[PDB]
Protein backbone atom coordinates (compact mmCIF):
# COMPACT_ATOMS: atom_id res chain seq x y z
CA UNK A 1 0.00 0.00 0.00
CA UNK A 2 1.20 3.51 -0.84
CA UNK A 3 1.80 5.85 2.09
CA UNK A 4 -0.39 8.38 0.29
CA UNK A 5 -1.75 9.38 -3.08
CA UNK A 6 -2.06 12.94 -4.34
CA UNK A 7 -5.26 12.52 -6.33
CA UNK A 8 -7.44 14.49 -8.71
CA UNK A 9 -4.83 17.02 -9.78
CA UNK A 10 -2.89 17.79 -12.95
CA UNK A 11 0.61 16.36 -13.22
CA UNK A 12 3.32 18.42 -14.93
CA UNK A 13 6.05 15.79 -14.81
CA UNK A 14 9.04 18.04 -15.45
CA UNK A 15 9.87 16.66 -18.91
CA UNK A 16 8.48 19.78 -20.60
CA UNK A 17 5.18 18.25 -21.71
CA UNK A 18 1.64 19.62 -21.24
CA UNK A 19 0.12 18.65 -17.89
CA UNK A 20 -2.27 15.71 -17.70
CA UNK A 21 -4.87 14.60 -15.17
CA UNK A 22 -3.25 11.92 -13.03
CA UNK A 23 -2.70 10.85 -9.42
CA UNK A 24 0.71 10.47 -7.81
CA UNK A 25 1.41 7.64 -5.39
CA UNK A 26 4.23 7.69 -2.86
CA UNK A 27 5.75 4.86 -0.82
CA UNK A 28 8.62 5.77 1.47
CA UNK A 29 10.92 8.21 -0.33
CA UNK A 30 9.82 7.16 -3.82
CA UNK A 31 7.12 8.01 -6.35
CA UNK A 32 5.49 4.57 -6.61
CA UNK A 33 3.17 5.29 -9.53
CA UNK A 34 1.60 7.96 -11.71
CA UNK A 35 -1.75 7.88 -13.48
CA UNK A 36 -5.19 6.62 -12.51
CA UNK A 37 -4.41 5.21 -9.06
CA UNK A 38 -7.95 4.59 -7.85
CA UNK A 39 -7.21 0.85 -7.86
CA UNK A 40 -4.08 1.23 -5.71
CA UNK A 41 -4.44 0.82 -1.97
CA UNK A 42 -3.14 3.84 -0.05
CA UNK A 43 -3.22 4.84 3.62
CA UNK A 44 -4.24 8.35 2.58
CA UNK A 45 -5.82 9.81 -0.54
CA UNK A 46 -5.16 13.56 -0.49
CA UNK A 47 -7.45 15.61 -2.73
CA UNK A 48 -5.54 18.14 -4.82
CA UNK A 49 -8.26 18.88 -7.38
CA UNK A 50 -7.60 22.10 -9.26
CA UNK A 51 -3.91 21.88 -8.33
CA UNK A 52 -0.77 20.96 -10.21
CA UNK A 53 1.54 18.27 -8.85
CA UNK A 54 5.06 18.85 -10.14
CA UNK A 55 8.58 17.81 -9.19
CA UNK A 56 10.10 19.80 -6.35
CA UNK A 57 11.84 22.95 -7.53
CA UNK A 58 15.62 22.76 -7.63
CA UNK A 59 17.29 26.09 -6.88
CA UNK A 60 20.26 26.05 -9.26
CA UNK A 61 21.92 29.06 -7.66
CA UNK A 62 21.92 29.48 -3.89
CA UNK A 63 24.19 30.81 -1.18
CA UNK A 64 22.47 28.60 1.39
CA UNK A 65 25.71 26.90 2.48
CA UNK A 66 25.47 28.11 6.07
CA UNK A 67 21.73 28.73 6.17
CA UNK A 68 21.21 24.96 5.85
CA UNK A 69 23.07 24.55 9.15
CA UNK A 70 21.71 27.52 11.11
CA UNK A 71 18.09 27.46 9.90
CA UNK A 72 17.31 23.86 8.97
CA UNK A 73 13.67 24.76 8.30
CA UNK A 74 14.86 26.55 5.14
CA UNK A 75 11.57 28.43 5.09
CA UNK A 76 12.64 31.02 2.47
CA UNK A 77 13.01 28.16 0.00
CA UNK A 78 10.47 25.47 0.96
CA UNK A 79 7.76 28.15 1.12
CA UNK A 80 8.38 28.65 -2.62
CA UNK A 81 8.31 24.95 -3.47
CA UNK A 82 12.08 24.38 -3.43
CA UNK A 83 13.12 20.84 -2.50
CA UNK A 84 16.82 20.91 -3.45
CA UNK A 85 19.46 23.64 -3.30
CA UNK A 86 22.79 23.90 -5.12
CA UNK A 87 25.29 25.59 -2.79
CA UNK A 88 28.79 27.06 -2.93
CA UNK A 89 28.32 29.39 -5.89
CA UNK A 90 30.38 32.23 -7.36
CA UNK A 91 33.53 30.87 -5.73
CA UNK A 92 31.87 31.33 -2.33
CA UNK A 93 31.56 28.18 -0.22
CA UNK A 94 31.36 27.91 3.56
CA UNK A 95 34.04 25.20 3.55
CA UNK A 96 36.91 24.52 3.67
CA UNK A 97 37.98 27.55 5.71
CA UNK A 98 38.60 28.27 9.38
CA UNK A 99 38.57 32.07 9.60
CA UNK A 100 36.98 34.51 12.05
CA UNK A 101 36.81 37.37 9.54
CA UNK A 102 36.67 35.99 5.96
CA UNK A 103 37.07 38.55 3.13
CA UNK A 104 33.97 39.84 1.33
CA UNK A 105 31.93 38.46 -0.35
CA UNK A 106 32.50 35.36 1.80
CA UNK A 107 30.94 37.33 4.65
CA UNK A 108 27.57 36.97 2.92
CA UNK A 109 27.40 33.46 4.45
CA UNK A 110 28.72 34.43 7.88
CA UNK A 111 26.51 34.75 10.96
CA UNK A 112 29.52 35.18 13.24
CA UNK A 113 32.26 32.59 13.46
CA UNK A 114 30.40 30.44 10.93
CA UNK A 115 33.56 29.56 8.97
CA UNK A 116 34.72 26.77 11.28
CA UNK A 117 35.10 23.83 8.88
CA UNK A 118 38.75 23.04 8.15
CA UNK A 119 37.82 20.27 5.73
CA UNK A 120 34.95 20.14 3.25
CA UNK A 121 34.09 16.68 4.58
CA UNK A 122 33.51 18.19 8.04
CA UNK A 123 30.88 20.47 6.53
CA UNK A 124 29.06 17.66 4.71
CA UNK A 125 29.17 15.51 7.86
CA UNK A 126 27.53 18.36 9.80
CA UNK A 127 24.70 18.53 7.27
CA UNK A 128 24.14 14.78 7.33
CA UNK A 129 24.10 14.75 11.14
CA UNK A 130 21.46 17.51 11.36
CA UNK A 131 19.75 17.44 7.94
CA UNK A 132 17.88 20.51 6.63
CA UNK A 133 14.37 20.43 5.16
CA UNK A 134 15.74 20.39 1.60
CA UNK A 135 18.30 18.30 -0.27
CA UNK A 136 21.73 19.83 -0.76
CA UNK A 137 24.03 19.52 -3.78
CA UNK A 138 27.22 21.25 -2.62
CA UNK A 139 30.09 22.77 -4.57
CA UNK A 140 33.40 24.04 -3.22
CA UNK A 141 34.32 27.66 -3.97
CA UNK A 142 37.60 28.77 -5.53
CA UNK A 143 37.65 32.02 -3.53
CA UNK A 144 37.14 30.09 -0.31
CA UNK A 145 40.09 27.94 -1.38
CA UNK A 146 42.21 31.04 -2.04
CA UNK A 147 41.34 32.47 1.37
CA UNK A 148 42.34 29.17 2.98
CA UNK A 149 45.68 28.91 1.16
CA UNK A 150 46.98 32.33 0.10
CA UNK A 151 48.52 34.72 2.66
CA UNK A 152 48.10 37.43 0.01
CA UNK A 153 45.11 37.32 -2.35
CA UNK A 154 46.03 40.38 -4.43
CA UNK A 155 48.20 38.42 -6.86
CA UNK A 156 48.24 35.27 -8.99
CA UNK A 157 48.75 32.04 -7.05
CA UNK A 158 52.13 30.31 -7.08
CA UNK A 159 52.50 26.70 -8.20
CA UNK A 160 52.70 25.67 -4.54
CA UNK A 161 49.52 27.56 -3.66
CA UNK A 162 47.76 26.13 -6.71
CA UNK A 163 48.84 22.68 -5.57
CA UNK A 164 47.43 23.36 -2.09
CA UNK A 165 44.11 24.59 -3.49
CA UNK A 166 43.82 21.69 -5.94
CA UNK A 167 44.37 19.22 -3.09
CA UNK A 168 41.55 20.82 -1.08
CA UNK A 169 39.31 20.86 -4.15
CA UNK A 170 40.10 17.22 -4.87
CA UNK A 171 39.34 16.21 -1.27
CA UNK A 172 36.07 18.13 -1.46
CA UNK A 173 34.98 16.36 -4.64
CA UNK A 174 36.07 13.02 -3.18
CA UNK A 175 33.91 13.79 -0.15
CA UNK A 176 30.79 14.49 -2.19
CA UNK A 177 31.07 17.98 -3.68
CA UNK A 178 29.30 18.08 -7.05
CA UNK A 179 31.59 20.70 -8.53
CA UNK A 180 33.78 23.78 -8.14
CA UNK A 181 32.67 27.39 -8.61
CA UNK A 182 34.59 30.61 -9.28
CA UNK A 183 33.82 34.31 -9.00
CA UNK A 184 36.80 36.21 -10.42
CA UNK A 185 34.56 39.29 -10.43
CA UNK A 186 35.08 39.54 -6.67
CA UNK A 187 38.15 40.89 -4.79
CA UNK A 188 39.40 37.53 -3.42
CA UNK A 189 39.84 36.15 -6.95
CA UNK A 190 40.18 39.26 -9.13
CA UNK A 191 43.92 38.55 -9.47
CA UNK A 192 43.39 34.87 -10.28
CA UNK A 193 44.56 34.04 -13.81
CA UNK A 194 42.66 31.77 -16.18
CA UNK A 195 45.45 29.19 -15.89
CA UNK A 196 45.25 29.25 -12.08
CA UNK A 197 41.54 28.47 -12.28
CA UNK A 198 42.14 25.67 -14.76
CA UNK A 199 44.82 23.96 -12.65
CA UNK A 200 42.78 24.18 -9.45
CA UNK A 201 39.76 22.71 -11.24
CA UNK A 202 41.61 19.83 -12.96
CA UNK A 203 40.04 17.27 -10.53
CA UNK A 204 36.58 17.88 -12.00
CA UNK A 205 37.25 15.49 -14.88
CA UNK A 206 38.42 12.75 -12.50
CA UNK A 207 35.41 13.07 -10.19
CA UNK A 208 32.91 14.03 -12.88
CA UNK A 209 31.88 17.37 -11.41
CA UNK A 210 30.70 20.63 -12.94
CA UNK A 211 32.40 24.02 -13.26
CA UNK A 212 30.10 26.88 -12.23
CA UNK A 213 30.95 30.54 -12.61
CA UNK A 214 30.09 34.11 -11.74
CA UNK A 215 31.91 35.44 -14.80
CA UNK A 216 34.81 37.87 -14.41
CA UNK A 217 32.64 40.67 -15.84
CA UNK A 218 28.96 40.93 -16.78
CA UNK A 219 28.98 44.32 -18.46
CA UNK A 220 31.31 46.08 -20.91
CA UNK A 221 33.67 43.10 -21.07
CA UNK A 222 31.13 40.28 -20.88
CA UNK A 223 32.17 38.89 -24.28
CA UNK A 224 35.72 38.44 -22.99
CA UNK A 225 34.37 36.92 -19.76
CA UNK A 226 32.22 34.51 -21.78
CA UNK A 227 35.17 33.50 -23.95
CA UNK A 228 37.28 32.88 -20.84
CA UNK A 229 34.51 30.68 -19.46
CA UNK A 230 34.20 28.68 -22.68
CA UNK A 231 37.99 28.30 -22.85
CA UNK A 232 38.09 26.98 -19.28
CA UNK A 233 35.36 24.51 -20.21
CA UNK A 234 37.34 23.21 -23.18
CA UNK A 235 40.54 22.86 -21.16
CA UNK A 236 38.85 20.98 -18.30
CA UNK A 237 36.49 19.06 -20.57
CA UNK A 238 33.63 19.29 -18.07
CA UNK A 239 30.18 20.94 -18.11
CA UNK A 240 30.25 24.67 -17.41
CA UNK A 241 27.41 26.57 -15.75
CA UNK A 242 27.13 30.33 -16.26
CA UNK A 243 25.63 31.81 -13.09
CA UNK A 244 22.87 34.44 -13.00
CA UNK A 245 23.33 35.49 -16.62
CA UNK A 246 22.67 39.16 -17.26
CA UNK A 247 23.98 42.26 -19.03
CA UNK A 248 24.45 45.01 -16.43
CA UNK A 249 24.68 48.76 -16.84
CA UNK A 250 22.79 51.10 -19.18
CA UNK A 251 25.57 50.85 -21.77
CA UNK A 252 24.88 47.12 -22.03
CA UNK A 253 21.08 47.09 -22.11
CA UNK A 254 19.86 44.99 -25.02
CA UNK A 255 23.11 43.06 -25.30
CA UNK A 256 21.39 39.87 -24.11
CA UNK A 257 20.71 39.23 -27.81
CA UNK A 258 24.46 39.20 -28.41
CA UNK A 259 25.42 37.16 -25.34
CA UNK A 260 22.70 34.53 -25.82
CA UNK A 261 23.84 34.08 -29.42
CA UNK A 262 27.41 33.42 -28.23
CA UNK A 263 26.16 30.98 -25.60
CA UNK A 264 23.93 29.13 -28.06
CA UNK A 265 26.84 28.84 -30.48
CA UNK A 266 29.10 27.49 -27.73
CA UNK A 267 26.49 24.91 -26.74
CA UNK A 268 26.79 23.43 -30.23
CA UNK A 269 30.42 22.44 -29.68
CA UNK A 270 30.84 22.10 -25.91
CA UNK A 271 28.85 21.49 -22.71
CA UNK A 272 27.37 24.81 -21.55
CA UNK A 273 24.49 25.68 -19.22
CA UNK A 274 23.19 28.83 -17.53
CA UNK A 275 20.68 30.03 -14.95
CA UNK A 276 19.16 33.35 -13.98
CA UNK A 277 16.81 34.98 -11.48
CA UNK A 278 13.61 36.82 -12.55
CA UNK A 279 14.50 40.37 -11.45
CA UNK A 280 16.05 43.60 -12.75
CA UNK A 281 18.17 44.17 -9.64
CA UNK A 282 21.18 42.29 -8.36
CA UNK A 283 22.51 41.94 -4.83
CA UNK A 284 25.83 41.11 -3.20
CA UNK A 285 28.56 42.76 -1.12
CA UNK A 286 28.67 46.57 -1.19
CA UNK A 287 31.47 47.17 -3.69
CA UNK A 288 33.27 50.13 -5.25
CA UNK A 289 32.05 49.42 -8.78
CA UNK A 290 31.05 52.26 -11.08
CA UNK A 291 28.52 50.13 -12.96
CA UNK A 292 26.91 48.44 -9.95
CA UNK A 293 26.56 51.87 -8.32
CA UNK A 294 25.29 53.75 -11.39
CA UNK A 295 21.62 53.31 -10.53
CA UNK A 296 19.35 52.90 -7.53
CA UNK A 297 21.25 51.16 -4.74
CA UNK A 298 19.83 49.92 -1.42
CA UNK A 299 21.77 48.71 1.64
CA UNK A 300 20.89 45.18 2.80
CA UNK A 301 23.08 45.27 5.93
CA UNK A 302 26.01 47.32 7.22
CA UNK A 303 28.59 46.29 9.82
CA UNK A 304 30.07 49.69 10.83
CA UNK A 305 26.67 51.43 10.71
CA UNK A 306 23.84 48.90 11.28
CA UNK A 307 21.20 51.62 11.15
CA UNK A 308 21.85 51.97 7.42
CA UNK A 309 20.11 48.68 6.56
CA UNK A 310 17.25 49.37 4.17
CA UNK A 311 18.41 52.88 3.29
CA UNK A 312 19.00 54.30 -0.18
CA UNK A 313 22.74 54.66 -0.83
CA UNK A 314 22.37 57.86 -2.84
CA UNK A 315 20.82 59.51 0.20
CA UNK A 316 23.57 58.22 2.47
CA UNK A 317 26.27 59.30 0.03
CA UNK A 318 24.72 62.70 -0.67
CA UNK A 319 24.33 63.38 3.03
CA UNK A 320 27.97 62.44 3.60
CA UNK A 321 28.92 64.77 0.76
CA UNK A 322 30.24 62.08 -1.58
CA UNK A 323 29.29 60.03 -4.62
CA UNK A 324 28.04 56.49 -4.03
CA UNK A 325 31.34 55.17 -5.36
CA UNK A 326 33.40 57.32 -2.99
CA UNK A 327 31.28 56.61 0.10
CA UNK A 328 31.48 52.81 -0.17
CA UNK A 329 34.84 52.34 1.62
CA UNK A 330 33.70 53.90 4.90
CA UNK A 331 30.56 51.74 4.94
CA UNK A 332 32.28 48.39 4.40
CA UNK A 333 31.75 45.64 5.07
CA UNK A 334 28.13 45.88 3.93
CA UNK A 335 25.68 44.43 1.42
CA UNK A 336 23.42 46.01 -1.18
CA UNK A 337 20.79 45.67 -3.90
CA UNK A 338 21.70 47.14 -7.29
CA UNK A 339 19.10 48.14 -9.87
CA UNK A 340 21.29 47.76 -12.94
CA UNK A 341 19.40 45.51 -15.37
CA UNK A 342 16.63 46.07 -17.92
CA UNK A 343 13.37 44.06 -18.03
CA UNK A 344 13.65 43.24 -21.78
CA UNK A 345 17.02 41.54 -21.22
CA UNK A 346 15.81 39.68 -18.15
CA UNK A 347 12.83 38.38 -20.10
CA UNK A 348 14.96 37.40 -23.09
CA UNK A 349 17.36 35.46 -20.86
CA UNK A 350 14.57 33.71 -18.90
CA UNK A 351 12.82 32.76 -22.16
CA UNK A 352 16.03 31.49 -23.77
CA UNK A 353 15.43 27.72 -23.96
CA UNK A 354 18.27 26.29 -21.75
CA UNK A 355 18.06 28.92 -18.99
CA UNK A 356 17.47 27.30 -15.58
CA UNK A 357 15.96 29.22 -12.67
CA UNK A 358 18.25 30.18 -9.78
CA UNK A 359 17.37 32.55 -6.92
CA UNK A 360 20.81 33.82 -5.85
CA UNK A 361 19.08 34.43 -2.53
CA UNK A 362 21.21 35.90 0.27
CA UNK A 363 19.44 34.41 3.35
CA UNK A 364 21.49 36.11 6.07
CA UNK A 365 20.76 39.64 4.79
CA UNK A 366 18.86 41.93 7.19
CA UNK A 367 16.81 43.55 4.41
CA UNK A 368 17.19 41.02 1.55
CA UNK A 369 16.50 41.16 -2.17
CA UNK A 370 13.02 39.55 -2.60
CA UNK A 371 14.43 36.90 -4.96
CA UNK A 372 15.25 35.05 -1.73
CA UNK A 373 11.53 34.50 -1.15
CA UNK A 374 9.79 34.79 -4.53
CA UNK A 375 11.98 33.60 -7.40
CA UNK A 376 10.21 30.39 -8.35
CA UNK A 377 6.60 31.52 -7.93
CA UNK A 378 7.49 34.69 -9.87
CA UNK A 379 8.46 32.53 -12.86
CA UNK A 380 5.40 30.26 -12.55
CA UNK A 381 2.89 33.04 -11.95
CA UNK A 382 3.93 36.48 -13.14
CA UNK A 383 6.02 35.34 -16.11
CA UNK A 384 4.37 32.12 -17.28
CA UNK A 385 0.72 32.70 -16.40
CA UNK A 386 0.36 36.49 -16.46
CA UNK A 387 2.81 37.48 -19.19
CA UNK A 388 2.81 34.23 -21.15
CA UNK A 389 6.61 34.23 -21.50
CA UNK A 390 6.43 30.44 -21.74
CA UNK A 391 3.82 27.76 -21.08
CA UNK A 392 3.61 26.43 -17.51
CA UNK A 393 5.18 23.05 -18.33
CA UNK A 394 8.22 24.81 -19.78
CA UNK A 395 8.51 27.11 -16.74
CA UNK A 396 8.31 24.04 -14.49
CA UNK A 397 10.87 22.18 -16.63
CA UNK A 398 13.25 25.14 -16.22
CA UNK A 399 13.28 24.56 -12.44
CA UNK A 400 13.04 20.76 -12.33
CA UNK A 401 13.90 18.34 -15.15
CA UNK A 402 16.37 20.61 -16.91
CA UNK A 403 18.20 21.47 -13.70
CA UNK A 404 18.36 17.91 -12.37
CA UNK A 405 19.87 16.94 -15.73
CA UNK A 406 22.48 19.70 -15.85
CA UNK A 407 23.66 19.10 -12.28
CA UNK A 408 23.48 15.31 -12.50
CA UNK A 409 20.96 14.88 -9.71
CA UNK A 410 19.88 11.32 -10.47
CA UNK A 411 16.28 10.25 -9.97
CA UNK A 412 15.05 13.76 -9.13
CA UNK A 413 13.42 16.55 -11.12
CA UNK A 414 10.68 14.42 -12.65
CA UNK A 415 7.37 12.94 -11.55
CA UNK A 416 8.23 9.40 -12.67
CA UNK A 417 7.70 6.02 -11.02
CA UNK A 418 10.92 5.06 -9.25
CA UNK A 419 12.18 8.63 -8.85
CA UNK A 420 12.54 10.30 -5.45
CA UNK A 421 9.38 11.90 -4.10
CA UNK A 422 10.46 15.56 -4.12
CA UNK A 423 7.14 17.15 -5.04
CA UNK A 424 5.22 20.41 -5.03
CA UNK A 425 1.46 20.91 -5.05
CA UNK A 426 0.53 24.39 -6.26
CA UNK A 427 -2.46 26.26 -7.62
CA UNK A 428 -1.54 27.37 -11.15
CA UNK A 429 -4.19 30.08 -11.00
CA UNK A 430 -2.94 31.73 -7.81
CA UNK A 431 0.75 30.84 -7.52
CA UNK A 432 2.60 34.13 -7.22
CA UNK A 433 5.57 35.85 -5.62
CA UNK A 434 4.37 37.98 -2.71
CA UNK A 435 7.81 39.26 -1.79
CA UNK A 436 8.53 42.80 -2.99
CA UNK A 437 11.56 45.02 -2.50
CA UNK A 438 9.51 46.86 0.14
CA UNK A 439 8.50 43.60 1.88
CA UNK A 440 11.10 41.03 0.70
CA UNK A 441 10.19 38.23 3.11
CA UNK A 442 6.52 37.65 2.29
CA UNK A 443 5.60 33.99 1.70
CA UNK A 444 4.54 33.07 -1.83
CA UNK A 445 0.88 32.50 -2.68
CA UNK A 446 -0.49 29.32 -4.24
CA UNK A 447 1.94 26.83 -2.69
CA UNK A 448 -0.30 24.16 -1.14
CA UNK A 449 2.31 21.64 0.00
CA UNK A 450 5.91 20.56 -0.58
CA UNK A 451 7.44 17.10 -0.17
CA UNK A 452 11.08 16.09 0.13
CA UNK A 453 12.00 12.42 -0.17
CA UNK A 454 8.33 11.62 0.43
CA UNK A 455 7.93 13.64 3.62
CA UNK A 456 5.83 16.80 3.67
CA UNK A 457 8.04 19.73 4.73
CA UNK A 458 5.57 22.50 3.93
CA UNK A 459 1.86 22.26 4.77
CA UNK A 460 -0.75 24.77 5.93
CA UNK A 461 1.78 27.54 5.26
CA UNK A 462 4.25 26.27 7.84
CA UNK A 463 7.33 24.07 8.20
CA UNK A 464 6.20 20.61 9.33
CA UNK A 465 9.32 19.85 11.34
CA UNK A 466 10.45 17.14 8.90
CA UNK A 467 14.22 17.42 8.38
CA UNK A 468 13.95 15.28 5.25
CA UNK A 469 16.76 16.63 3.08
CA UNK A 470 19.81 14.62 2.07
CA UNK A 471 23.30 15.56 0.93
CA UNK A 472 23.34 14.60 -2.75
CA UNK A 473 26.15 13.35 -4.97
CA UNK A 474 26.60 13.90 -8.71
ZN1 LIG B 1 27.49 35.55 -8.32
Automatic annotation (TrEMBL):
Its EC number is 3.5.1.81. InterPro entries: Amidohydro_3, D-aminoacylase_insert_dom_sf, Metal-dep_hydrolase_composite, Metal_Hydrolase, Metallo-dep_Hydrolases_sf. Zn(2+) 5 binds at residues 195, 199. SUPFAM superfamilies: Composite domain of metallo-dependent hydrolases, Metallo-dependent hydrolases. It comes from the Bacteria. Zn(2+) 7 binds at residues 315, 319. GO terms for cellular component: cytosol. Residues 46-326 form the Amidohydrolase domain. Zn(2+) 8 binds at residues 382, 386. Zn(2+) 4 binds at residues 170, 207. Zn(2+) 2 binds at residues 71, 111. Zn(2+) 1 binds at residues 61, 63, 90, 360. Keywords: Hydrolase, Metal-binding, Zinc. Cu(2+) binds at residues 61, 63, 90, 360. Zn(2+) 3 binds at residues 90, 214, 244. GO terms for molecular function: hydrolase activity, acting on carbon-nitrogen (but not peptide) bonds, in cyclic amides; metal ion binding; N-acyl-D-amino-acid deacylase activity. Zn(2+) 9 binds at residue 467. Zn(2+) 6 binds at residue 237. This is D-aminoacylase. It comes from Alcaligenes faecalis.
Amino acid sequence: PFDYILSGGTVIDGTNAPGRLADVGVRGDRIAAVGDLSASSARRRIDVAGKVVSPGFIDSHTHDDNYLLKHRDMTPKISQGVTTVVTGNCGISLAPLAHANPPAPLDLLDEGGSFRFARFSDYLEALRAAPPAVNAACMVGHSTLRAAVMPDLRREATADEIQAMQALADDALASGAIGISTGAFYPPAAHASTEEIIEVCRPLITHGGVYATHMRDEGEHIVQALEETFRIGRELDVPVVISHHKVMGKLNFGRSKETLALIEAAMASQDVSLDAYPYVAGSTMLKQDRVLLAGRTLITWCKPYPELSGRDLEEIAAERGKSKYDVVPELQPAGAIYFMMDEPDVQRILAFGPTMIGSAGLPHDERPHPRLWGTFPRVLGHYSRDLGLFPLETAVWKMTGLTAAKFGLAERGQVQPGYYADLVVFDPATVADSATFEHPTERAAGIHSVYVNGAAVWEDQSFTGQHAGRVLNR
